[PDB]
Short mmCIF file of N, CA, C and O and ligand atoms in Angstrom, two decimals:
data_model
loop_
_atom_site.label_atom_id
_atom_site.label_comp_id
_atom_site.label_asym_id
_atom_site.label_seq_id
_atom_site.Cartn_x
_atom_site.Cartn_y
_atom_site.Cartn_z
N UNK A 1 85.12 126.74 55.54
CA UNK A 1 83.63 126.70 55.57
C UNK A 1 83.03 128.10 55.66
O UNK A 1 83.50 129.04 56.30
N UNK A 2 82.01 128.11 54.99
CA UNK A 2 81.42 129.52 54.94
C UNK A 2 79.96 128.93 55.59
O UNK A 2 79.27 128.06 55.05
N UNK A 3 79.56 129.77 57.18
CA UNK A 3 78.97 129.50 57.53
C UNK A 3 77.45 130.35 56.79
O UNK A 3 77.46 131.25 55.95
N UNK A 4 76.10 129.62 57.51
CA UNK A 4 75.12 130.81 57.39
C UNK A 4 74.65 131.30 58.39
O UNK A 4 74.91 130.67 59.41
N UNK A 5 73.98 132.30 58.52
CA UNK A 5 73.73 133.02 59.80
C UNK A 5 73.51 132.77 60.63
O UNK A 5 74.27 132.84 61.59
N UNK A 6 72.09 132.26 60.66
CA UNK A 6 71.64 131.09 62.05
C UNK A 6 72.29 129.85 61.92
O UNK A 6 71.77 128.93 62.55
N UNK A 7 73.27 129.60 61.29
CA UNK A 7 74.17 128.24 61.35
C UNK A 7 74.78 128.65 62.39
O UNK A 7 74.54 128.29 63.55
N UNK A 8 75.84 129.67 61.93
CA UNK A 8 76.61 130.20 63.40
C UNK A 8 76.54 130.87 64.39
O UNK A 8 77.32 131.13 65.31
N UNK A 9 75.21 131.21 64.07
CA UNK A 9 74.25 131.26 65.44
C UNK A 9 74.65 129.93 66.43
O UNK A 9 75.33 129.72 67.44
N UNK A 10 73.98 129.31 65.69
CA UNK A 10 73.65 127.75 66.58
C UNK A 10 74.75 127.45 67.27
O UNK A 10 74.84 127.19 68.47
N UNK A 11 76.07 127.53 65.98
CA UNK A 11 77.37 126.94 66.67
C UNK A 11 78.05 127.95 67.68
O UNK A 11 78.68 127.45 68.61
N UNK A 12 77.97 129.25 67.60
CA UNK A 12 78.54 129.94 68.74
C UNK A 12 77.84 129.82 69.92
O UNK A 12 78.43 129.87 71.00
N UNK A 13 76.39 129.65 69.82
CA UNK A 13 75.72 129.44 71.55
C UNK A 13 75.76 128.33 71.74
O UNK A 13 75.71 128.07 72.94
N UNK A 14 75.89 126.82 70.57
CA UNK A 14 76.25 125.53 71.02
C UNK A 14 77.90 125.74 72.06
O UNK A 14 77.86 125.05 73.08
N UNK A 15 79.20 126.54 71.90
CA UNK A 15 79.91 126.84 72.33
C UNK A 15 80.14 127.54 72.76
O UNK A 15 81.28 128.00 72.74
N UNK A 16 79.01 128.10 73.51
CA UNK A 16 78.75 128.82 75.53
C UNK A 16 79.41 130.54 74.88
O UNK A 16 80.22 131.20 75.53
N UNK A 17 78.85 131.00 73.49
CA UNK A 17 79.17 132.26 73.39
C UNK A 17 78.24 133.45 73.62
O UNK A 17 78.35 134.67 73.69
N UNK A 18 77.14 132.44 73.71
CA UNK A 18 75.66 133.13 73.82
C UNK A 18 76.04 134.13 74.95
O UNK A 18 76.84 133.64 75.75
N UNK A 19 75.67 135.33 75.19
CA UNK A 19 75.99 136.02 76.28
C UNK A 19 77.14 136.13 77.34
O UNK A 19 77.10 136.65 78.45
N UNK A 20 78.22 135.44 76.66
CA UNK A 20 79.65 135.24 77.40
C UNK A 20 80.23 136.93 77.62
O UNK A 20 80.58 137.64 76.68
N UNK A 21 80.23 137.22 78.65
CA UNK A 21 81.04 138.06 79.06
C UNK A 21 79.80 139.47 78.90
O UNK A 21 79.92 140.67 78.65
N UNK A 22 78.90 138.77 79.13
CA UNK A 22 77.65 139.75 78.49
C UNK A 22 77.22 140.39 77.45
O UNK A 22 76.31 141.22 77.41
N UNK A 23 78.18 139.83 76.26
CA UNK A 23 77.46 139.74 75.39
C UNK A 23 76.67 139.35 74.33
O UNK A 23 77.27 138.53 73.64
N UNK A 24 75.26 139.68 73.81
CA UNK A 24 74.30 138.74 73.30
C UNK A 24 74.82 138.22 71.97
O UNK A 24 75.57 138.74 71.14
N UNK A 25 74.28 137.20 71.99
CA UNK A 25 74.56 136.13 70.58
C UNK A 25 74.67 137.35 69.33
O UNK A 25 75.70 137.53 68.68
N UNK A 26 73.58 138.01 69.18
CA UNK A 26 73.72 139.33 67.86
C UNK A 26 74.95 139.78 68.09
O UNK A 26 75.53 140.02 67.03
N UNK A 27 75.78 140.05 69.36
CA UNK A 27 77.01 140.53 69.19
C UNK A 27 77.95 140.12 68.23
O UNK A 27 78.64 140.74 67.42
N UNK A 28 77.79 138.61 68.58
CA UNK A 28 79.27 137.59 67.93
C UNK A 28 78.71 137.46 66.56
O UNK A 28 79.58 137.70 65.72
N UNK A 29 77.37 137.12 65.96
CA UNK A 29 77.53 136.95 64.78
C UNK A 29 77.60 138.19 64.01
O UNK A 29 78.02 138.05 62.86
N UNK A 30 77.26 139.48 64.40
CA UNK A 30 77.50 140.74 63.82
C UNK A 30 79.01 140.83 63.34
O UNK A 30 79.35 140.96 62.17
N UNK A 31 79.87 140.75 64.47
CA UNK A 31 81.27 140.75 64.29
C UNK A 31 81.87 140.00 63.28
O UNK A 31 82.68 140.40 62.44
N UNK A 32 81.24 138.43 63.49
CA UNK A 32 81.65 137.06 62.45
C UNK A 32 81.13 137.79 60.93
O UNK A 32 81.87 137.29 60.08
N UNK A 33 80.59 138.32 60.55
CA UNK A 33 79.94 139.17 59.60
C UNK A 33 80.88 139.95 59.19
O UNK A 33 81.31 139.27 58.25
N UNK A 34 81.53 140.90 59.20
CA UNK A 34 82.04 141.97 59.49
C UNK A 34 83.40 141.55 59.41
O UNK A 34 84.25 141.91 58.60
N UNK A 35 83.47 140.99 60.06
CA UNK A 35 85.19 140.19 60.25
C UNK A 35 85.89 139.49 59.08
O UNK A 35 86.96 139.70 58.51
N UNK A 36 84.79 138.50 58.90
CA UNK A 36 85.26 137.47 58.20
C UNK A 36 84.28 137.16 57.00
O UNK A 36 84.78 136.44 56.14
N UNK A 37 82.68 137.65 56.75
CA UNK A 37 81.66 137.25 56.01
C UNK A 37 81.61 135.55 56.17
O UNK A 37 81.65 134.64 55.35
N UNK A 38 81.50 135.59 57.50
CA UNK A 38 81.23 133.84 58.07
C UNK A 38 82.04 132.92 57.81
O UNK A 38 81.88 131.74 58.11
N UNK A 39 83.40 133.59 56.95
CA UNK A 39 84.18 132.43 56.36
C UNK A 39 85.16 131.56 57.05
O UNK A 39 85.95 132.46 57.34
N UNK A 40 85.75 130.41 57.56
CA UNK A 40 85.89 130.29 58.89
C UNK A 40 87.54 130.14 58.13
O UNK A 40 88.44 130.09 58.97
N UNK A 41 88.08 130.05 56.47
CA UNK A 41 89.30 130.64 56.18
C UNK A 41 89.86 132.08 56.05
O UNK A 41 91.07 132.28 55.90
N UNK A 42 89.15 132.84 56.10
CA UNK A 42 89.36 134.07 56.29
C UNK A 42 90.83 134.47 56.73
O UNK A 42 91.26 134.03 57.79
N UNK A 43 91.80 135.51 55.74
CA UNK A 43 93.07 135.54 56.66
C UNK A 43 93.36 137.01 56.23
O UNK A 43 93.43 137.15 55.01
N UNK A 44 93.56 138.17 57.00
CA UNK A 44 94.03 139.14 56.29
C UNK A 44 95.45 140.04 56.78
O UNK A 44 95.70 140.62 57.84
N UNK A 45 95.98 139.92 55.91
CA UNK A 45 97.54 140.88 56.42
C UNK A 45 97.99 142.35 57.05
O UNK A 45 98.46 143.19 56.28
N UNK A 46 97.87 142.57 58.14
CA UNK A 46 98.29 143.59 58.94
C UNK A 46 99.21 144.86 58.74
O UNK A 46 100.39 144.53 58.85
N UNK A 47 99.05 146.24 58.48
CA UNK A 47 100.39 146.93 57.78
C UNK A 47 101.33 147.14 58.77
O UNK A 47 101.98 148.19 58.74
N UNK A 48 101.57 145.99 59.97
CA UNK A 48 102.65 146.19 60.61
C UNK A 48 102.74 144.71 61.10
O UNK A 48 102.89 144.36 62.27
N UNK A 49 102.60 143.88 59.97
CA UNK A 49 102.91 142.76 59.64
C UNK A 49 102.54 141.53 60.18
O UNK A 49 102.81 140.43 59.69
N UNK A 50 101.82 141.78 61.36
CA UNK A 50 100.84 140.67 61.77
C UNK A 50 99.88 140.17 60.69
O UNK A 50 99.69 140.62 59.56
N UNK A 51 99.33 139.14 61.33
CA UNK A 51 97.80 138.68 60.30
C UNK A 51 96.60 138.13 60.99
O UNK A 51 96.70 137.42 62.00
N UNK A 52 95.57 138.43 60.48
CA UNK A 52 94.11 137.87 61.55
C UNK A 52 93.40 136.63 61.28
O UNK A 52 93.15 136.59 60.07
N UNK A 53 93.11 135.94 61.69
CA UNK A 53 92.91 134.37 61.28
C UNK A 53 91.52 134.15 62.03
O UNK A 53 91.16 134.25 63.21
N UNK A 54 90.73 133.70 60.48
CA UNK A 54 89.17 132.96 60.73
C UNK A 54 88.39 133.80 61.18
O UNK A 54 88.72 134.97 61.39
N UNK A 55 87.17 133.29 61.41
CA UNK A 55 86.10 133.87 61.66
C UNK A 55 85.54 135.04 62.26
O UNK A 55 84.67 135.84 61.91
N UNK A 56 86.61 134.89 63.67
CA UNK A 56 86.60 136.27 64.04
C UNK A 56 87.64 136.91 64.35
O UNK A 56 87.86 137.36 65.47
N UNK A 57 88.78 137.07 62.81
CA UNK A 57 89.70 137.67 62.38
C UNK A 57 90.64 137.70 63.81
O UNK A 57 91.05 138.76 64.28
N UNK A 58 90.91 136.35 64.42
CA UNK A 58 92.18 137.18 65.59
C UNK A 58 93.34 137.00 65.01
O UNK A 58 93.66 136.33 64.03
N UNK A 59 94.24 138.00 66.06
CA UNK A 59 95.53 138.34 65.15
C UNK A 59 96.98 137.57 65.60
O UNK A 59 96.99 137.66 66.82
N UNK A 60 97.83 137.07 65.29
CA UNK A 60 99.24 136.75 65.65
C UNK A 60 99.67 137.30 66.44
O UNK A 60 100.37 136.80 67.32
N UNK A 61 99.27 138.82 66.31
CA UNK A 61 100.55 140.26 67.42
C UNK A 61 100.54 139.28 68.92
O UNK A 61 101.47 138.84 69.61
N UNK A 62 99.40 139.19 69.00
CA UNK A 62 98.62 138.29 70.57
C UNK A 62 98.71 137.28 70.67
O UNK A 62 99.46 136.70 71.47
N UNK A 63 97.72 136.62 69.62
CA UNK A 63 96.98 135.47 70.47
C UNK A 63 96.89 134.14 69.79
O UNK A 63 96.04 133.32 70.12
N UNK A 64 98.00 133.86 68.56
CA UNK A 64 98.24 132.91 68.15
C UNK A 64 99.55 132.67 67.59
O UNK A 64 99.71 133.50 66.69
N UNK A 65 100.43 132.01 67.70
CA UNK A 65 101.15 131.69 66.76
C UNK A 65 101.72 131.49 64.94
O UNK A 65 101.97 130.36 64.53
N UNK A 66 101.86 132.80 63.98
CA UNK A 66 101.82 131.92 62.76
C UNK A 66 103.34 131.76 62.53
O UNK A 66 103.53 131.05 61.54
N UNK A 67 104.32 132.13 63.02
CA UNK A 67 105.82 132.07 63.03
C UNK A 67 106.44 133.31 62.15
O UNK A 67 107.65 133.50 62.10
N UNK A 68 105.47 134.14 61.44
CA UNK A 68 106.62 135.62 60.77
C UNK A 68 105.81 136.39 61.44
O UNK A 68 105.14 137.13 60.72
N UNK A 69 105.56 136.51 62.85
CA UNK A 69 105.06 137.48 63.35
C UNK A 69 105.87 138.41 64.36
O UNK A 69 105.42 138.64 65.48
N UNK A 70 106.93 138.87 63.98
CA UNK A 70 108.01 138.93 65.04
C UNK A 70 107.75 140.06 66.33
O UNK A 70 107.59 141.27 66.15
N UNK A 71 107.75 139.36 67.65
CA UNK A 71 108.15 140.08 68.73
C UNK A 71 106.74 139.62 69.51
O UNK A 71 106.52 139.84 70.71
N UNK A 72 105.68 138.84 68.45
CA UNK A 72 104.34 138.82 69.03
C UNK A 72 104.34 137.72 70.10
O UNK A 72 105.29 137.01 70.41
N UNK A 73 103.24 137.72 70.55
CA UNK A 73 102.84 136.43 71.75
C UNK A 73 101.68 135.45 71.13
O UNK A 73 100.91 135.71 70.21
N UNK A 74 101.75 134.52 71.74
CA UNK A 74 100.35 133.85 71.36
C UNK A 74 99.45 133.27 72.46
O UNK A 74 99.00 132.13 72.51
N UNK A 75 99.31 134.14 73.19
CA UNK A 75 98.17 133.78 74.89
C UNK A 75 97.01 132.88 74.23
O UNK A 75 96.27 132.39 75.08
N UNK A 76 96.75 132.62 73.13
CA UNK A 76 95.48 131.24 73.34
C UNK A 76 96.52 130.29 72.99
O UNK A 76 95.84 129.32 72.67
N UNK A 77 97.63 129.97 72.86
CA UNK A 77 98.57 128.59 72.97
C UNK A 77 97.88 127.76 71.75
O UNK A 77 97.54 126.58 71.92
N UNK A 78 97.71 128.35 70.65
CA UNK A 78 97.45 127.74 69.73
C UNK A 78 98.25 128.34 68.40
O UNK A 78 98.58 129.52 68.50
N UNK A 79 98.59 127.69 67.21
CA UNK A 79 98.61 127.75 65.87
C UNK A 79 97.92 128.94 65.52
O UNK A 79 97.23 129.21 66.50
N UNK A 80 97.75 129.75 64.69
CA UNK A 80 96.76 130.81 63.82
C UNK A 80 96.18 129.65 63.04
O UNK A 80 94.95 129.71 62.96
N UNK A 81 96.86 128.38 62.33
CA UNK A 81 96.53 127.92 61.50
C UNK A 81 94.71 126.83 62.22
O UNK A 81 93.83 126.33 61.52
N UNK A 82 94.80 126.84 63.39
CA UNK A 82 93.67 126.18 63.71
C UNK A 82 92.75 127.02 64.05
O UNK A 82 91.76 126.55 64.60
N UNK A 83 92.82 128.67 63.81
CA UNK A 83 91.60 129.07 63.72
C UNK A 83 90.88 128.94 62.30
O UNK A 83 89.66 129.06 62.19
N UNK A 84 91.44 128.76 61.60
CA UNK A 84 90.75 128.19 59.98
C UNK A 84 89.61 127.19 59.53
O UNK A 84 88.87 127.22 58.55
N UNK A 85 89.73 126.12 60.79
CA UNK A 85 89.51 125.19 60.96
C UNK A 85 87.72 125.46 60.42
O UNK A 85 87.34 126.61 60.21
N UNK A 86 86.90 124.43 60.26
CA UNK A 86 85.81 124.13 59.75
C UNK A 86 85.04 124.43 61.36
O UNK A 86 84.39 125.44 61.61
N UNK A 87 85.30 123.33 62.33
CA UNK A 87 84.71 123.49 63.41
C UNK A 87 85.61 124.43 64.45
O UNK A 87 86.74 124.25 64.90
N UNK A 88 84.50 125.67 64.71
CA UNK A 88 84.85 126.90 65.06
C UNK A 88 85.31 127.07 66.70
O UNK A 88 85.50 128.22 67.11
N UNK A 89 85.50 125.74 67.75
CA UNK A 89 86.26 125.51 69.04
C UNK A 89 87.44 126.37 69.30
O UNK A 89 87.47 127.13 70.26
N UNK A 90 88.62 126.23 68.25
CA UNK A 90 89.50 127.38 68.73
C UNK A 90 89.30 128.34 68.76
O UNK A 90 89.22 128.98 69.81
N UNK A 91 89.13 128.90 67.46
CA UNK A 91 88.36 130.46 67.49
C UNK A 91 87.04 131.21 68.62
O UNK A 91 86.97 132.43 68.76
N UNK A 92 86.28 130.43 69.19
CA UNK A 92 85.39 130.38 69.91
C UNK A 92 86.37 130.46 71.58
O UNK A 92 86.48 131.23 72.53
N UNK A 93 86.70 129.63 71.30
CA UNK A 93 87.79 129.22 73.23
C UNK A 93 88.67 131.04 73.01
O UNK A 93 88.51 131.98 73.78
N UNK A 94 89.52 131.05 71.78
CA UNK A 94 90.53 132.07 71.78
C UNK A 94 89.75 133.57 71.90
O UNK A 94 90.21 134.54 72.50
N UNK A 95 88.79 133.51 71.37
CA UNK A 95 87.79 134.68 71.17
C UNK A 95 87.02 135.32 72.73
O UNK A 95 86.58 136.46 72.91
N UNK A 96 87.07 134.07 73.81
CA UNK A 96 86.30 134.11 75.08
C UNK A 96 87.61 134.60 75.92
O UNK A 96 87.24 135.21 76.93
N UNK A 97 89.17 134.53 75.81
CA UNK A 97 90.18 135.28 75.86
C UNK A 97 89.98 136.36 75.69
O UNK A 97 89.68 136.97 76.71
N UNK A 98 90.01 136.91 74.83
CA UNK A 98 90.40 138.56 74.32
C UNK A 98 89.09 139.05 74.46
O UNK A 98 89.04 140.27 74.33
N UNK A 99 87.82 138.41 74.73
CA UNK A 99 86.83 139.67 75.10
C UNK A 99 86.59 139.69 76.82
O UNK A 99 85.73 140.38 77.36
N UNK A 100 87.72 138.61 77.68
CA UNK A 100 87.80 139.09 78.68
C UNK A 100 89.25 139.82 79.18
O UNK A 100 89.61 139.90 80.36
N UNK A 101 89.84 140.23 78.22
CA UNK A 101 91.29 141.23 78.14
C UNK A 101 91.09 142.21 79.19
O UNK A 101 91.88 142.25 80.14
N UNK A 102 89.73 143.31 79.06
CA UNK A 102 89.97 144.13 79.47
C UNK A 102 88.98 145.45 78.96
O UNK A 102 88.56 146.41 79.60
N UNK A 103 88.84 145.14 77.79
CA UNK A 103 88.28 146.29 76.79
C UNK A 103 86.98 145.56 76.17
O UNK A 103 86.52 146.21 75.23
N UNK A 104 86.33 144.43 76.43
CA UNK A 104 85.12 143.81 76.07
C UNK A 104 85.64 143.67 74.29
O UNK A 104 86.76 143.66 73.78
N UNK A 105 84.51 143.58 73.82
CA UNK A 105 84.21 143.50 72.49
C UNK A 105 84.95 144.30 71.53
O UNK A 105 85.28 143.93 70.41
N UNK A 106 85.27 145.79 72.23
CA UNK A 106 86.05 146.75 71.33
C UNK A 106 87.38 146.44 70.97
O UNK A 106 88.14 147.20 70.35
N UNK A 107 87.76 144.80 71.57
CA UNK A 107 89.33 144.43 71.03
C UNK A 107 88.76 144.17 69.29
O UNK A 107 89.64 144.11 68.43
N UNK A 108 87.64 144.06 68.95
CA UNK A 108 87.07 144.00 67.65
C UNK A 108 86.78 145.40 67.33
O UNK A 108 85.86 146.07 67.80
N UNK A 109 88.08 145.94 66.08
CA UNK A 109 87.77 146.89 65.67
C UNK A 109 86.15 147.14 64.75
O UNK A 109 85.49 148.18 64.71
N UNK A 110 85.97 146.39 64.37
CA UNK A 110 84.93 146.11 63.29
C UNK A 110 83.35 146.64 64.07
O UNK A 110 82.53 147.54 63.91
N UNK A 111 83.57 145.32 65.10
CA UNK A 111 82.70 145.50 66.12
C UNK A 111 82.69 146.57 66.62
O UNK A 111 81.55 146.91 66.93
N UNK A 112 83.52 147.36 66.89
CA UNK A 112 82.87 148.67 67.52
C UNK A 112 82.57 149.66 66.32
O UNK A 112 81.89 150.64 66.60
N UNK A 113 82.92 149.53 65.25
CA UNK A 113 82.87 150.50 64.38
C UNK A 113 81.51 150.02 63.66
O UNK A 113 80.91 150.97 63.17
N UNK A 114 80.73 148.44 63.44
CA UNK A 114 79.98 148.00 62.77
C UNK A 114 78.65 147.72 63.65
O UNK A 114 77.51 148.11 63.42
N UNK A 115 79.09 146.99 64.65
CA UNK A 115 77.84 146.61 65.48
C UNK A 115 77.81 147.13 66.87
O UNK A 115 76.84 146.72 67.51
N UNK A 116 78.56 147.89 67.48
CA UNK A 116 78.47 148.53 68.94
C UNK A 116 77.35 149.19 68.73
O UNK A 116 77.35 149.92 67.74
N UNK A 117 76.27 149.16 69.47
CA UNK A 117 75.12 150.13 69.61
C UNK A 117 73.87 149.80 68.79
O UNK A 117 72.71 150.01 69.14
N UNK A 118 74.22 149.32 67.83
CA UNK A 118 73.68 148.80 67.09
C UNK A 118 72.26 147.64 66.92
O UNK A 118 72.46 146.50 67.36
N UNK A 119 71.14 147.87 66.41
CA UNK A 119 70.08 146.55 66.90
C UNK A 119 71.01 145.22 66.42
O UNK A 119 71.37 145.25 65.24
N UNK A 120 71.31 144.41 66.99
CA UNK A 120 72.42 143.04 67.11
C UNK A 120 71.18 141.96 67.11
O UNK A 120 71.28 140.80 66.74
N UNK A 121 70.00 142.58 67.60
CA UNK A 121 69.04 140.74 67.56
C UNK A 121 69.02 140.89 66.28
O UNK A 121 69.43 139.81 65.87
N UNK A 122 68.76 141.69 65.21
CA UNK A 122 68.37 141.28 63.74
C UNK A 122 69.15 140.32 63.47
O UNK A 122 68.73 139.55 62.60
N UNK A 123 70.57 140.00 64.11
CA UNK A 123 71.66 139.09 63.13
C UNK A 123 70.91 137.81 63.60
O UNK A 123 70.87 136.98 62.69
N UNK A 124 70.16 137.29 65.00
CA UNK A 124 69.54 136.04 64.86
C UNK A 124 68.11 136.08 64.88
O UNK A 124 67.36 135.17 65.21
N UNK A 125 67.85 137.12 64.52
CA UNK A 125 66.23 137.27 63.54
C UNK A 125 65.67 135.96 63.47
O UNK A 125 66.43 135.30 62.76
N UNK A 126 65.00 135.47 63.74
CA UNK A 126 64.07 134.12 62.99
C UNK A 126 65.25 132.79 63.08
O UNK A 126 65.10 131.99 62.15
N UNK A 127 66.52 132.43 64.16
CA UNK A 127 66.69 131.56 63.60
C UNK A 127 66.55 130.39 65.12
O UNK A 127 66.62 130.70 66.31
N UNK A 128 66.39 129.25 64.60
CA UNK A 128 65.76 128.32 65.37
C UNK A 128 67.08 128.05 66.52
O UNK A 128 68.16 127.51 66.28
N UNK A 129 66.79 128.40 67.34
CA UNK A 129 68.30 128.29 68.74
C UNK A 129 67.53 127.12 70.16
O UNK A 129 68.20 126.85 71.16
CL1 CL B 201 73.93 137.41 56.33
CL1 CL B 202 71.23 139.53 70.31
CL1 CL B 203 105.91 134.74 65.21
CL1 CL B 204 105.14 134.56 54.70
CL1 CL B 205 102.62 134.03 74.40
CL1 CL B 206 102.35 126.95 66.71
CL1 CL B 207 81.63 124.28 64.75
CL1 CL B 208 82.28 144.72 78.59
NA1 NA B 209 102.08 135.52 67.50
#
Protein backbone atom coordinates (compact mmCIF):
# COMPACT_ATOMS: atom_id res chain seq x y z
CA UNK A 1 0.00 0.00 0.00
CA UNK A 2 1.15 3.34 -0.83
CA UNK A 3 -0.10 5.53 1.70
CA UNK A 4 -1.08 9.46 1.40
CA UNK A 5 0.11 11.94 3.66
CA UNK A 6 -2.57 12.76 5.95
CA UNK A 7 -3.63 9.07 5.47
CA UNK A 8 -0.60 8.16 7.47
CA UNK A 9 -0.91 10.83 9.40
CA UNK A 10 -4.15 9.49 10.70
CA UNK A 11 -2.83 5.93 10.92
CA UNK A 12 0.39 6.66 12.85
CA UNK A 13 -1.46 8.89 15.62
CA UNK A 14 -4.49 6.32 15.31
CA UNK A 15 -1.36 4.01 16.63
CA UNK A 16 -0.22 6.20 19.70
CA UNK A 17 2.83 7.60 17.39
CA UNK A 18 1.69 11.04 17.69
CA UNK A 19 4.37 12.44 20.00
CA UNK A 20 5.72 8.99 21.25
CA UNK A 21 8.90 9.41 22.79
CA UNK A 22 8.48 13.15 22.05
CA UNK A 23 8.27 13.15 18.96
CA UNK A 24 5.65 15.18 16.85
CA UNK A 25 3.51 13.42 14.27
CA UNK A 26 5.67 15.72 11.38
CA UNK A 27 8.49 13.66 12.72
CA UNK A 28 7.19 10.12 11.66
CA UNK A 29 5.62 11.09 8.51
CA UNK A 30 8.76 13.11 7.35
CA UNK A 31 10.82 9.96 7.91
CA UNK A 32 7.86 7.57 6.27
CA UNK A 33 8.62 10.01 3.28
CA UNK A 34 12.11 9.74 3.07
CA UNK A 35 12.33 6.17 4.00
CA UNK A 36 10.02 4.55 2.09
CA UNK A 37 7.82 7.35 -0.16
CA UNK A 38 4.79 5.98 2.07
CA UNK A 39 5.14 2.66 0.50
CA UNK A 40 4.34 0.18 3.18
CA UNK A 41 6.39 -2.62 0.53
CA UNK A 42 9.31 -0.83 0.46
CA UNK A 43 12.56 -3.14 0.84
CA UNK A 44 16.09 -2.03 0.30
CA UNK A 45 19.45 -4.04 0.42
CA UNK A 46 22.22 -3.10 2.81
CA UNK A 47 26.13 -3.13 1.53
CA UNK A 48 26.82 -5.29 4.45
CA UNK A 49 24.03 -7.40 3.67
CA UNK A 50 21.22 -6.68 5.85
CA UNK A 51 17.87 -5.26 4.42
CA UNK A 52 15.24 -2.52 5.62
CA UNK A 53 11.63 -3.41 5.51
CA UNK A 54 8.41 -1.05 4.94
CA UNK A 55 7.55 2.07 5.75
CA UNK A 56 9.92 3.05 8.01
CA UNK A 57 12.72 1.11 6.36
CA UNK A 58 13.74 -1.08 9.65
CA UNK A 59 16.51 -3.30 9.23
CA UNK A 60 17.19 -7.26 9.89
CA UNK A 61 20.91 -6.38 11.50
CA UNK A 62 18.31 -5.67 14.71
CA UNK A 63 15.05 -5.81 14.71
CA UNK A 64 13.49 -8.36 12.57
CA UNK A 65 14.00 -11.53 11.31
CA UNK A 66 14.42 -12.16 7.32
CA UNK A 67 16.72 -15.43 7.68
CA UNK A 68 20.07 -14.30 5.25
CA UNK A 69 20.87 -11.87 7.70
CA UNK A 70 23.73 -13.50 9.37
CA UNK A 71 24.89 -12.82 13.00
CA UNK A 72 21.79 -10.27 13.27
CA UNK A 73 19.05 -10.16 16.08
CA UNK A 74 15.53 -9.47 15.77
CA UNK A 75 14.40 -7.51 19.25
CA UNK A 76 10.77 -6.69 17.77
CA UNK A 77 10.20 -10.73 17.61
CA UNK A 78 8.77 -10.40 14.40
CA UNK A 79 9.28 -11.55 10.57
CA UNK A 80 10.80 -8.45 8.32
CA UNK A 81 8.16 -9.91 6.15
CA UNK A 82 5.23 -8.34 8.38
CA UNK A 83 6.55 -5.05 8.19
CA UNK A 84 5.22 -4.98 4.48
CA UNK A 85 2.07 -5.50 5.59
CA UNK A 86 -0.87 -3.01 4.35
CA UNK A 87 -1.88 -2.26 8.01
CA UNK A 88 1.12 -0.47 9.49
CA UNK A 89 0.83 -2.21 13.56
CA UNK A 90 4.15 -3.95 13.23
CA UNK A 91 6.09 -1.39 11.81
CA UNK A 92 4.49 1.18 14.16
CA UNK A 93 4.91 -1.30 17.59
CA UNK A 94 8.74 -2.15 16.05
CA UNK A 95 9.45 1.53 15.25
CA UNK A 96 8.29 2.67 19.15
CA UNK A 97 11.39 0.07 19.95
CA UNK A 98 14.22 1.58 18.25
CA UNK A 99 13.25 5.21 18.89
CA UNK A 100 13.40 4.26 22.51
CA UNK A 101 17.07 2.45 21.94
CA UNK A 102 18.84 5.17 23.09
CA UNK A 103 19.66 7.63 20.27
CA UNK A 104 15.84 8.93 19.60
CA UNK A 105 14.98 9.36 16.02
CA UNK A 106 18.67 9.50 14.74
CA UNK A 107 18.48 5.48 14.64
CA UNK A 108 16.79 6.98 11.23
CA UNK A 109 19.54 7.85 9.12
CA UNK A 110 17.27 9.71 6.72
CA UNK A 111 15.64 11.40 9.52
CA UNK A 112 18.45 13.02 10.76
CA UNK A 113 19.89 13.86 7.53
CA UNK A 114 16.18 14.87 5.98
CA UNK A 115 13.94 16.06 8.72
CA UNK A 116 16.00 16.72 12.08
CA UNK A 117 15.56 20.43 12.59
CA UNK A 118 13.59 20.81 10.11
CA UNK A 119 9.74 22.63 9.95
CA UNK A 120 8.06 18.78 10.40
CA UNK A 121 4.31 20.41 10.89
CA UNK A 122 4.29 21.07 7.04
CA UNK A 123 4.20 17.10 6.62
CA UNK A 124 0.55 17.32 8.45
CA UNK A 125 -0.24 20.72 6.99
CA UNK A 126 -4.08 20.81 6.57
CA UNK A 127 -4.80 17.25 7.36
CA UNK A 128 -7.97 16.38 9.28
CA UNK A 129 -6.52 14.39 12.70
CL1 LIG B 1 3.80 13.96 -0.03
CL1 LIG C 1 4.57 18.04 13.75
CL1 LIG D 1 19.08 -13.97 9.72
CL1 LIG E 1 18.18 -13.91 -0.79
CL1 LIG F 1 17.00 -11.14 18.85
CL1 LIG G 1 10.65 -15.09 11.53
CL1 LIG H 1 -2.83 0.82 9.24
CL1 LIG I 1 15.16 11.92 22.00
NA1 LIG J 1 17.75 -10.21 11.87
Amino acid sequence: KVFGRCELAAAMKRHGLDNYRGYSLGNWVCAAKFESNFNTQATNRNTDGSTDYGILQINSRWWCNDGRTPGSRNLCNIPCSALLSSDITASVNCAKKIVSDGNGMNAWVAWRNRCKGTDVQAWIRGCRL
